[PDB]
C-alpha cells in the first residue's frame, strides 16, 4: 500500500505514471486485490451491487424530473402526432443568437432537446396523465435510491454481513428469484395494469387517493372465486376507440385479441394484462422446484449427476459441474451475460414489429433510436459472455475435479471446433462477397438482368406459415383446411391475421432477393465473431506456441520476439480483435433495419428492393443520398436545428480517426520520444524549477490497445448515432 | 549538457540570474509579487481585444474580468503544487552549489513555507497587475493601438 491505489502494493511502488493509469483499470478486479479472501470477495460484490441499483434509480429519477419540469408532457398528450416530445432545456452560454432561435421548438420558450428515447409514449400507456404524477414519480425513485445506498453500507459492518454459505446457497436463491423476483413482480404489474392503466385508457382517473372505491370490473372479485372467469373477457374495447376517452370503451379487463389497437398502432392493453398474468403463474409454479429446508424438491447436484448417458459418448457427463459452477464467479457471470445478451437482441427484434406503447409506431425516429440502441447493447454484452468464459478457464477451472465430464471434453477436441468454425466462416465469406461483386460488375456494364438474384424462399415459406398471403404458398394458418387454422380461428387469428397482412406495420415485412444476401452477411458476422471468441476461450489454458499460457493470467502483453514473435497472444487479445467484428456485424444489422424501414416509411419500397443487390446501391442510395440534410447543419449561409447533429457527426469521425493512432503506432517509438522531451524540460531555464512527481512514460502495450479501441468504439457509435437520428428526423418519415 | 553560446554567455547568464525566479537571496514573498505583476499586466490585452465582447463597449471590463480569473486559477494550480511537492518541515531541494563551486544557501522558494509565501506574492501581484493595465488603457489611453 502506502498510497493510491490502496488495494495493490505492487502498483503503489511503481514510480512512473504507469501507477495512475493502472490504479484505475484494476479497481474493480476484486480477486487480484492484495489480501483478498473469499468472504471479502462476496461482501464487496454484494455492497457494489447496491451501488449499481442506486445509480439505476437515480438515473430514472432524472428523466421524470426534467420531463415534468421542462417538458411537453401535458401538451403532448393532447395530440401525440404533432407535438415533438421534449427531453430537457438548453442553457449553453456559448450559443449565439441564430442558434437560440433555431433550437426553440416543441412549443417551448427557449432552446430545448427533443426526446427520442420514447419515454413519453411509455408513460402515456402505463397511465400517467399530468405533470404531478411525474413529480411523485421522481421523489419515489429518489427515495428508493436512498434506500439502496443505505443497504450497500449496512451489509459491510459486522453482524450484518452474510457468511460464505449464505451466498453459495444456490437452491434457496433459485426458488426466490424464480418465484419471488420474476414471479410476484409480474403478478403485481398485472395488478397495476388493471387498476390504473386500463382504467386510464377508458377515461377513468384512478390514483392512490381513491383506488379503493373504483372496481376494475363492475362485478369484480367474484367471478374469479366462483370459477367462471369467462366474464372478464366479455365486452372488450370496441374497434372505434379513442385511446384517452370513453368512446367505444368496453369493460373487459383480461382478453385475448392479438391484433393492434386500430388508432394507436400498438398492442391492446387487455392482452398485455393477460400475458403478465399468465407468466405470473408459470414462474410461481416453477419456483418450488429445488429443495431448501422442507425436505421436498430436487437437488441440483443430483440432477447433474443423474444425466450421464450410457454408452459413454458424453464421458462422465455432467458429473462435478455443480461445484465448478458453484465455486467460480467468472463462470456464473459468463452464463448471466449469455442469457442477457440474447434477450436484449430479442427485445430489439420484438419491439419494432409489435409496438407495445401507444403512438410509437408513427414516431419514426424513436423506433430507429430504440432498435439500434438495444442491438449495440446486445453486441457488447454477448462479447463479455465469452470474455468471462476465458477468465474461467484461467483462474478458476480445475482439470482434476472436471475429469472427462462434458466440460473437459470441450478442451479435448478444440481443434475440431476451431477448424469448422473456420470453414463455415470461409464458405460464407467467399460466396456472400462473391455473389456481391458479381452483382456489382453486372450492373457496371449496364446489364441488370445478369445479376444473381436468389429468392429467399425458406423465409417466405415461414412467413406463409404465419398467415402472410403475399407469397401464396397456402400452408398452415394460410390455408383454410388446416386444423392449426381451425384451432385458432375463434381466438386470435382474426386480429393476428389482420395485422400480418396490413402493409403499414413492420409485422413480417415483404422480403426479396436483397434480404437474402444481407442475411448471410449477418450470418457471416456471427460465425467469424464467434470464431475469434471461441478460439480465444479454448486456447486460454495453452497452445503449441506457448503451452503454459495459464501461468501468466488473462491479460499479458506478449511473450517476446522469440520463436517467431508472439504479438497478440493473450486471451485478452482474442477479446480485443472480437470487438472489431462485433461493431462491424452490428453495423451490418442496424444498417439493414434502417434502410429497409426508411424506404417503407416513404412508401418507396421499390428503391430498396432493387438497389440492395449491388454494393454501390448501398453506398449511393443509402449513405450518400440520405446524408444530404445532415451535412447542411451549418454552412456559410446559416444554421439549423440539425447543426448539433452535424457537429457530432464530425466529432464522431475525429475520435474514430484518433483510434488508429494507438492501434498502429506501437509503444517503443513513443518511449524514445518522451526521453528527448524529458531532457528538454530538464534543461530549460525557468522551467527546470518544476519537477514531475511521477516520472513520465509512454502507455503500456495493453493499455494502448485498450485506449485505441476505446476511441474506435466511441467514434463508431457517435458517428452512426448522429446520422441515424438526423437523417430520419430531418424528414420525420 | 553542453556549453553552447545560448546556454552560457555573459549576456545570457546575466539576464537570467537577475530576474525574480533566480534571485536566490531575497524574500520569496516579493519574488512572488514581482512575478504576478509582470504576468498579470501582460495578459489583459488578448482577453480584452480578442474575447467574445471586443466589439461591445464592455470590452474593457470583460477582458479584465477574464484576466482576473486566469490569475486566480493559476493561483490554485500554484497551491496544489506547493502542497503536494513539499512537506511542512522538510528542507529545500534547490542546488546549493554554484558553477565555481561555492556552496551557497539553498533557495527558500523550494520550501513549503517559502512556496506558500510565493503564491501569496503571485496572487496579490497578479490582480494588482491586471487592474493597472485597465486603469492605463482606459484613462491614460491616447497613444495605444487599441
Amino acid at each position: 500500500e502506502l498510497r493510491f491505489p490502496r488495494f495493490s502494493q505492487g502498483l503503489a511502488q511503481d514510480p512512473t505514471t504507469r501507477r495512475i493509469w493502472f490504479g484505475i483499470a484494476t479497481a474493480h478486479d476484486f480477486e487480484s486485490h492484495d489480501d483478498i479472501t473469499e468472504e471479502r470477495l462476496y461482501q464487496n460484490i454484494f455492497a457494489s451491487h447496491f451501488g449499481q441499483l442506486a445509480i439505476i434509480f437515480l438515473w430514472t429519477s432524472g428523466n421524470l424530473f426534467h420531463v415534468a419540469w421542462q417538458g411537453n408532457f401535458e401538451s403532448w398528450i393532447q395530440d401525440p402526432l404533432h407535438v415533438r416530445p421534449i427531453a430537457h432545456a438548453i442553457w449553453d452560454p456559448h450559443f449565439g443568437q441564430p442558434a437560440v432561435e433555431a433550437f426553440t421548438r416543441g412549443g417551448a420558450a427557449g432552446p430545448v432537446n427533443i426526446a427520442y428515447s420514447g419515454v413519453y409514449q411509455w408513460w402515456y400507456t402505463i397511465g400517467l396523465r399530468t405533470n404531478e404524477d411525474l413529480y411523485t414519480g421522481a421523489l419515489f425513485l429518489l427515495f428508493l435510491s436512498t434506500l439502496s445506498l443505505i443497504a450497500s453500507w449496512l451489509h459491510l459492518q459486522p453482524k450484518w454481513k452474510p457468511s460464505l454459505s449464505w451466498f453459495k446457497n444456490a437452491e434457496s436463491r433459485l426458488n426466490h428469484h424464480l418465484s419471488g423476483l420474476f414471479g410476484v413482480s409480474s403478478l403485481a404489474w398485472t395488478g397495476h395494469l388493471v387498476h390504473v392503466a386500463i382504467p386510464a385508457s377508458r377515461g377513468e382517473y384512478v390514483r392512490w387517493n381513491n383506488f379503493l372505491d373504483v372496481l376494475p370490473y363492475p362485478q369484480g372479485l367474484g367471478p374469479l372465486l366462483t370459477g367462471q372467469w369467462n366474464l372478464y373477457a366479455q365486452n372488450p374495447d370496441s374497434s372505434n376507440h379513442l385511446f384517452g376517452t370513453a368512446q367505444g370503451a368496453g369493460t373487459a379487463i383480461l382478453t385475448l385479441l392479438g391484433g393492434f389497437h386500430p388508432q394507436t398502432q400498438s398492442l391492446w392493453l387487455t392482452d398485455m394484462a393477460h400475458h403478465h398474468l399468465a407468466i405470473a403463474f408459470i414462474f410461481l409454479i416453477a419456483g418450488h422446484m429445488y429443495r431448501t429446508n422442507f425436505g421436498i424438491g430436487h437437488s441440483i447436484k443430483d440432477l447433474l449427476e443423474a444425466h450421464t448417458p450410457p454408452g459413454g459418448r458424453l464421458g462422465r457427463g455432467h458429473k462435478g459441474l455443480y461445484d465448478t459452477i458453484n465455486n467460480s464467479i467468472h463462470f456464473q457471470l459468463g452464463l448471466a451475460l449469455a442469457s442477457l445478451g440474447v434477450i436484449t437482441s430479442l427485445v430489439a427484434q420484438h419491439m419494432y414489429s409489435l409496438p407495445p406503447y401507444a403512438f410509437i409506431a408513427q414516431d419514426f425516429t424513436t423506433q430507429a433510436a430504440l432498435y439500434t440502441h438495444h442491438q449495440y447493447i446486445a453486441g457488447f454484452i454477448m462479447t463479455g459472455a465469452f470474455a468471462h468464459g476465458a477468465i474461467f478457464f484461467i483462474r478458476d477451472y480445475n482439470p482434476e475435479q472436471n475429469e472427462d465430464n462434458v466440460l473437459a471434453r470441450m478442451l479435448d477436441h478444440k481443434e475440431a471446433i476451431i477448424s469448422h468454425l473456420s470453414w463455415a466462416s470461409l464458405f460464407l465469406g467467399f460466396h456472400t462477397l462473391g455473389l456481391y461483386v458479381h452483382n456489382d460488375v453486372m450492373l457496371a456494364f449496364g446489364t441488370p438482368e445478369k445479376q444473381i438474384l436468389i429468392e429467399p424462399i425458406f423465409a417466405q415459406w415461414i412467413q406463409s406459415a404465419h398467415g402472410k398471403t403475399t407469397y401464396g404458398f397456402d400452408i398452415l394458418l394460410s390455408s383454410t383446411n388446416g386444423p392449426a387454422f381451425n384451432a385458432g380461428r375463434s381466438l386470435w387469428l382474426p386480429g393476428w391475421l389482420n395485422a400480418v397482412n396490413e402493409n403499414s406495420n413492420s409485422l413480417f415485412l415483404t422480403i426479396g432477393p436483397g434480404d437474402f444476401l444481407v442475411h448471410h452477411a449477418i450470418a457471416l458476422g456471427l460465425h467469424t465473431t464467434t470464431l475469434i471468441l471461441v478460439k480465444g476461450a479454448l486456447d486460454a489454458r495453452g497452445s503449441k506456441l506457448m503451452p503454459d499460457k495459464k501461468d501468466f493470467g488473462y491479460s499479458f502483453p506478449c511473450d517476446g520476439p522469440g520463436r517467431g514473435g508472439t504479438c497478440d497472444i493473450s486471451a485478452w487479445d482474442a477479446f480485443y480483435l472480437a470487438v472489431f467484428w462485433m461493431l462491424n456485424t452490428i453495423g451490418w444489422v442496424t444498417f439493414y433495419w434502417h434502410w429497409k424501414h426508411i424506404t417503407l416509411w416513404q412508401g418507396n419500397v421499390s428503391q430498396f428492393n432493387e438497389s440492395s443487390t449491388y454494393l454501390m446501391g448501398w453506398l449511393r442510395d443509402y449513405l450518400w443520398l440520405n446524408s444530404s440534410q445532415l451535412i447542411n447543419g451549418y454552412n456559410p449561409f446559416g444554421m439549423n436545428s440539425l447543426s448539433v447533429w452535424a457537429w457530432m457527426f464530425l466529432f464522431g469521425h475525429l475520435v474514430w480517426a484518433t483510434g488508429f493512432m494507438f492501434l498502429i503506432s506501437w509503444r517503443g517509438y513513443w518511449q524514445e520520444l518522451i526521453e528527448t522531451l524529458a531532457w528538454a524540460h530538464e534543461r530549460t531555464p525557468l522551467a527546470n524549477l518544476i519537477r514531475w512527481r511521477d516520472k513520465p512514460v509512454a502507455l503500456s502495450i495493453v493499455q494502448a490497445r485498450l485506449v485505441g479501441l476505446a476511441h474506435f468504439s466511441v467514434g463508431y457509435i457517435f458517428t452512426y448515432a448522429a446520422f441515424l437520428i438526423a437523417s430520419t428526423s430531418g424528414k420525420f418519415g | 549538457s553542453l556549453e553552447t553560446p545560448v546556454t552560457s554567455s555573459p549576456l545570457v547568464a546575466w539576464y537570467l540570474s537577475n530576474l525574480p525566479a533566480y534571485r536566490t537571496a531575497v524574500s520569496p514573498l516579493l519574488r512572488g509579487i514581482e512575478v504576478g505583476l509582470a504576468h498579470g499586466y501582460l495578459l489583459v490585452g488578448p482577453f480584452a481585444l480578442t474575447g467574445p465582447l471586443r466589439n461591445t463597449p464592455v470590452h474593457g471590463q470583460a477582458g479584465t474580468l477574464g484576466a482576473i480569473g486566469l490569475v486566480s486559477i493559476l493561483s490554485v494550480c500554484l497551491t496544489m503544487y506547493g502542497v503536494a511537492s513539499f512537506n511542512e518541515g522538510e528542507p529545500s531541494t534547490a542546488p546549493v552549489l554554484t558553477l565555481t563551486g561555492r556552496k551557497k544557501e539553498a533557495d527558500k522558494l523550494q520550501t513549503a513555507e517559502g512556496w506558500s509565501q510565493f503564491t501569496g506574492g503571485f496572487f496579490f501581484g497578479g490582480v494588482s497587475g491586471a487592474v493597472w493595465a485597465y486603469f492605463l488603457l482606459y484613462v491614460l489611453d491616447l497613444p495605444y493601438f487599441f
Binding site: 502506502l2 493510491f4 442553457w91 449553453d92 | 490554485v76 503536494a84
Partner: peptide, 30 residues
Amino acid sequence: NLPSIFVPLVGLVFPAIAMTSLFLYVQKKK
C-alpha cells in the same frame, strides 16, 4: 433562472474542486 446557476456550478466549480481533490489524494505519500 435556476439553470444559470446550476450549469456553471457543475461545469466549472464542481470539476475544479474534484480535480484538485483527487490530485492531492493520488499524489500523497505515507
